[PDB]
């Protein structure tokens, strides 16, 4: 990748400041140019890319320089003395490794590479290694503590003693009821082949990786590590089997759960600081099952999961700054790099300030689910598709080949685990102008990012000025941010969701507003985050659901806010509940047609179908080539659809593969209202009023608004489209 | 109309132990009490039929039938009391949920002297919210109603009498003031003398949730009730404490049947029938999730005009266990008029003193949680089979006096969580069928499991009997003396207790012969403060007859997290390497033989069995492997060194995938299609403690056993295990 980058936010307010940080490997300056994004599908077939230079608004060129992509979670100890004395020095922790076969992976070193002075503990398939530095001379002295370790808990150490001459490295199975547990150790004579080091051999502490020339990721729980300076007053040492004058630090990872601290319960404070975000409020040793939140029994939650695929925060240089005149209007934009033929976007958005909106309408551009889906590796990139890519012009990075980029959370970890966590403070490839998701047989197989620039395309063709704020505005606004327009519209996919960004869609419903949910399987799911944690969202996948991975029980908790994670449905708060239709059934990207209700005509709500002959319409568009297609949604009464609910038409014909919605089954053949399955298999257009003074208009369909610009805007879904607007403008 | 019924105290006891029986008969005469030894209770004609041993000579009796009544219905009584009011009037109140209002009157709270016309009630109707006062003994009740559509949500309902000035106002608000058109009505009438304050010959029980003129029995959650001697619902902090007659907060003693009284009156009740506790009240926002770390987001009760735990019959007659006689599956036939029934019970052996090299666990848990299962299918057909085969004649679905199981919903729609075994257990009766089978008996749980008592008794081997609350009470101890551990047909509820006796017994060396299908599956709740009920809420998914709410996914009973075993982290196949895989219809399929099993360790089992099928046969389906099949995952901890003896094939399409091992419908947990799921796997295996584990993964396994006169190649298999197991 010759040029990319991510900013620190991705929206700004008038006078509000956006830092862009570049990353690029050419030896030249790039250009960067503020364009403003108005469509983002490159499918021949369709409108194209478009965008309206705005250079004279921003352009600049700006030095290069590469900077680099480190993934891998650990945790750092820094301002601290080398451990050891004349005495001797033992280390050890508690350890559950879940990914033995990737390689050595260290539970505990302090290495100063300059001097080759320090330790090092790890495990592999191998068994336990001990490495110590022996200065400038010699390569170092290693132990290996030969066994077979499983994905279980074991206490790991080793232990220096210079009175009897002794170096013991061992592991022992925590569990003794198990039919063999594991107990070896190595006993090797010392012989002066160590010694207490000097003060110049300090040097970081690490848990979790080595710092040798960063190497050594390890996967899986670490828990309680600690180190000691002397003897304690065969079974593994521990933390508590020594005086506290002997403890150089014993961790206990059950404090700040929420932060990135690992905090040294001794007398010598000498805490430290996790990197890349590696997974907290998890199960520990001692959690029996009687326990389920952290926030309350926080020694059954004593360990951190690491990942060597952990990435969060590049720490890249600002490269320029950008902030908003108060004359450029709220919208869609992004900075254009340039480089040697190469090019990519930094997309970002320009929010109306708080209670002075620009336009009648407001759009909500879903970024808790574009970061939710950032850099999915599908594993889908074939030769079909990279060709499809160069025909098409389209963006030319996928995931599959860029693993530099990080995890989705909706793929695993390299060790099998959920990706609980998805940073936008690095390159998020899936949200660029151009990218294309799906070999999509009947359209563009656009997703996100890209399929929402249809509905900003076709606002802006029909004459509707519109203002855009995102998932964090609502974060940090609330409903009063939503309160000045006349209608707000959502994407095509608005999955993810915090209560607080519920709470601003409900309470605008309630100040009388207009919402239309132009999309599918929204308001699914929880995401957790934190101010102490910028720029992360966190995702547990709770109970059932249609899920790419399932929670273990017991850390259903978020870490980064303590709320309880998964579906929307298991915090008592249903799609119906905000927009009549819920998420009912999940096929492949492909699309089909609504028929129309005709007995909708007559009741209220009715007239949006005017000039919209039927009886059947919208089998074509962009996003699998109908407009309900992917994900549908539908209503049910049980989940909280309004007794008033006015349904205008229902999807019929999709293919074998669409099949239903796993929350919503008390068995394969039962859903919760007691019906067959099959029923779920339809998207349902529906109208109704809020009782408030406003009015709902849902689709439950996420490829609705692939649709819109089908034959030069002209189609039965344009109309009906247009139909809402104006009765929401009113 | 059922002749004669009952039920016991408890269903098992062991030498010098004794079981108290308990009875209902409707006859004038009295009724004759009888010992037996259940043999085999499956009354099919293609079978073997009904087979009991006479024990007359060791327990028989002649008592008199009295007719005790089932009162179905859930309230809380406070009693010892006085009359509330005073000469300035009397208020009461409370916050609700009425879950049914179509369902007519229903009572939130009353305290009525029928003899003295005195007291009042305010219930709640599709038609609103009504007062009844007593007016003395020359006249009927005063009667105020408050008009308005109340629907599924909360409410503060309420009455004042006030003397001073000569009104009566009846009121409901609800709760949540954001919603669009929030309901806000009262009813003023004035008083006129019509109301005087109470002497002390009013006093009366204080009732919530049911009027004693018992009637009116309330569906939904009553909240923070009180009494006291624009505008505004009056609620328990409006009052100076010394004019408070009562208030009680639901949130003290979630885990137990008393209901406490704030003030210093200390007037504290107790609650009837085992309404639902551990439920959330109006304050709950989702922030928490557990009612043992935060009461005041579940003060409410969950009241249910079908609740029904403990009958109250009196004894009507009892029975030491001899030390002579031995441990084994026993029952009290009743007669009289003609009319038979069965009181089913087990004698166990005293721990440590094993009568037989095996010992069978009959699964009273999984008993429990299906009694009175009306199953909505007792149709015609079904009934002129039972007659024909002279098979038990009462079905729950023509009985509901007799309760739900915990399959059923409430009246109200809400799920049934609770199943108490102090009544009628109509399904746990010899000679009593579940479905209307074409290829076999209907045969489930009590009577399925006599298949495999019978098979063992006509092949020569002896067993003791334990029961599920056996080992709730003694623990991995009570299996240990025995060779092997046999289950039943459908061991599917479980505590932690249970699964660690067995857990415990194979680390102590054993045998275990899972004999079973979906077993291991479900957790129940259950405590020594209320003995004879046990609890099951159904979280998070997997195949649930219901789905519990979030939030309300702890036991009232225990404080444990409830739902699947899988979702307490101990999967099936930790246990027995096999678990829950698919569901269908009451039908079995054959097995296909591995081919390579044969040589490796256990192939032994396959014995004079010629294959490659086997067991296209049987009393339960008419095949070996059906209904619900269990199949090994690595993923869920089947031990690396399991051996797939056989795998079963051609189910029919009606089976389809267990819910809680699905991703989406198109992937499971171990990323495979859906259609791998569907299969009955026979696996051997040690367990690295000196013992081995035999599990069949199918429902219909033992209603193959006795097929062509107990020769046959499940009967073979079977007898090769128990031998193998010991030796």
């Not at 692939?706 to 403008?729: K, P």
Request: net charge negative; glycine share 10%.
């Amino acid at each position: 990748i010759t040029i990319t980058g991510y900013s620190d936010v991705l929206s700004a307010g008038p006078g509000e400041t956006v830092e862009f940080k570049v990353s690029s490997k050419s030896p030249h300056p790039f250009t960067a140019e503020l364009v403003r994004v108005i469509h983002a599908d490159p499918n021949p077939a369709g409108p194209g890319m478009r965008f309206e230079p705005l250079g004279q608004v921003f352009s600049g060129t700006f030095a290069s320089f590469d900077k680099p992509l480190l993934p891998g979670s650990f945790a750092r100890v820094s301002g601290v003395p080398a451990a050891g004395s004349a005495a001797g020095l033992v280390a050890g922790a508690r350890i559950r490794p879940t990914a033995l076969a990737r390689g050595d992976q260290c539970v505990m070193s302090q290495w100063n590479t300059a001097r080759h002075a320090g330790f090092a503990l790890l495990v592999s398939e191998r068994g336990l290694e001990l490495r110590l530095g022996a200065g400038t001379g010699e390569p170092p002295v290693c132990v290996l503590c030969a066994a077979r370790l499983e994905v279980r808990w074991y206490d790991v150490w080793f232990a220096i003693d210079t009175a009897s001459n002794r170096i013991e490295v061992g592991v022992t199975e925590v569990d003794g009821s198990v039919a063999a547990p594991v107990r070896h150790r190595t006993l090797q004579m010392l012989d002066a082949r160590w010694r207490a080091p000097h003060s110049d051999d300090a040097a970081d502490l690490l848990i979790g990786a080595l710092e040798d020339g960063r190497r050594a990721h390890f996967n899986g729980q670490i828990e309680a590590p600690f180190v000691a300076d002397a003897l304690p007053s065969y079974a593994a040492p521990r933390a508590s089997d020594f005086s506290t004058d002997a403890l150089y630090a014993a961790w206990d990872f059950a404090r700040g759960i929420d932060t990135l601290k690992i905090a040294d319960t001794t007398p010598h404070a000498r805490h430290g600081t996790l990197q890349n975000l590696p997974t907290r409020a998890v199960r520990s040793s001692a959690w029996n099952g009687r326990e389920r939140c952290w926030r309350t029994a926080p020694a059954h939650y004593a360990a951190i999961h690491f990942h060597d695929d952990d990435l969060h925060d590049a720490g890249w240089s600002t490269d320029f700054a950008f902030t908003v005149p108060a004359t450029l209007k709220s919208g869609a934009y992004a900075m254009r790099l340039s480089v040697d033929g190469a090019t990519d976007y930094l997309p970002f958005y320009v929010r109306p300030e708080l209670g002075r909106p620009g336009a009648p309408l407001v759009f909500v551009a879903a970024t808790y689910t574009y970061q939710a889906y950032a850099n999915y590796a599908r594993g889908n990139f074939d030769a079909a598709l990279r060709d499809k890519v160069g025909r098409w012009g389209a963006y030319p990075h996928n995931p599959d080949d860029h693993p530099e980029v990080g995890l989705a959370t909706y793929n695993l970890h390299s060790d099998g685990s959920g990706v609980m966590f998805s940073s936008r403070l690095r390159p998020m490839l899936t949200m660029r102008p151009g990218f294309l998701t799906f070999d999509d047989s009947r359209g563009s197989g656009c997703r996100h990012y890209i399929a929402d620039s249809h509905l900003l395309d076709w606002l802006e063709h029909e004459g509707f000025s519109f203002d855009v704020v995102t998932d964090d505005d609502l974060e940090r606004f609330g409903a009063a941010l939503l309160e000045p327009y006349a209608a707000v519209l959502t994407g095509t996919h608005p999955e993810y969701h915090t209560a607080a960004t519920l709470d601003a869609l409900a309470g605008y419903k309630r100040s009388g507003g207009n919402l239309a949910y132009l999309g599918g399987n929204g308001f699914y799911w929880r995401v957790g985050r934190s101010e102490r944690v910028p720029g992360a969202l966190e995702v547990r996948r709770t109970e059932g659901g249609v899920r790419a991975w399932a929670a273990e029980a017991g850390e259903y908790f978020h870490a980064l806010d303590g709320e309880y994670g998964g579906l929307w449905r298991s915090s008592a708060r249903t799609p119906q509940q905000l927009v009549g239709v819920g998420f009912s059934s999940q096929g492949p990207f492909e699309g089909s047609h609504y028929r129309v209700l005709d007995a909708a005509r007559s009741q209220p709500g009715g007239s949006l179908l005017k000039d919209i002959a039927g009886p059947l319409f919208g089998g074509y568009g962009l996003s699998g080539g109908g407009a309900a297609g992917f994900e549908l949604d539908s209503t049910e009464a049980a989940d909280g659809t309004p007794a008033n609910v006015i349904i205008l038409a229902r999807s019929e014909s999709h293919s074998a593969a669409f099949g239903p919605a796993l929350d919503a089954l008390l068995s394969h053949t039962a859903t919760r209202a007691r019906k067959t399955p099959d029923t779920l298999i339809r998207s349902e257009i529906v109208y109704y009023e809020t009782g408030y003074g406003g009015a709902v208009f849902s689709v439950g369909s996420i490829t609705f608004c692939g649709a819109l610009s089908h034959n030069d805007y002209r189609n039965d879904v344009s109309t009906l489209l247009r139909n809402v607007l104006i009765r929401f403008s009113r």
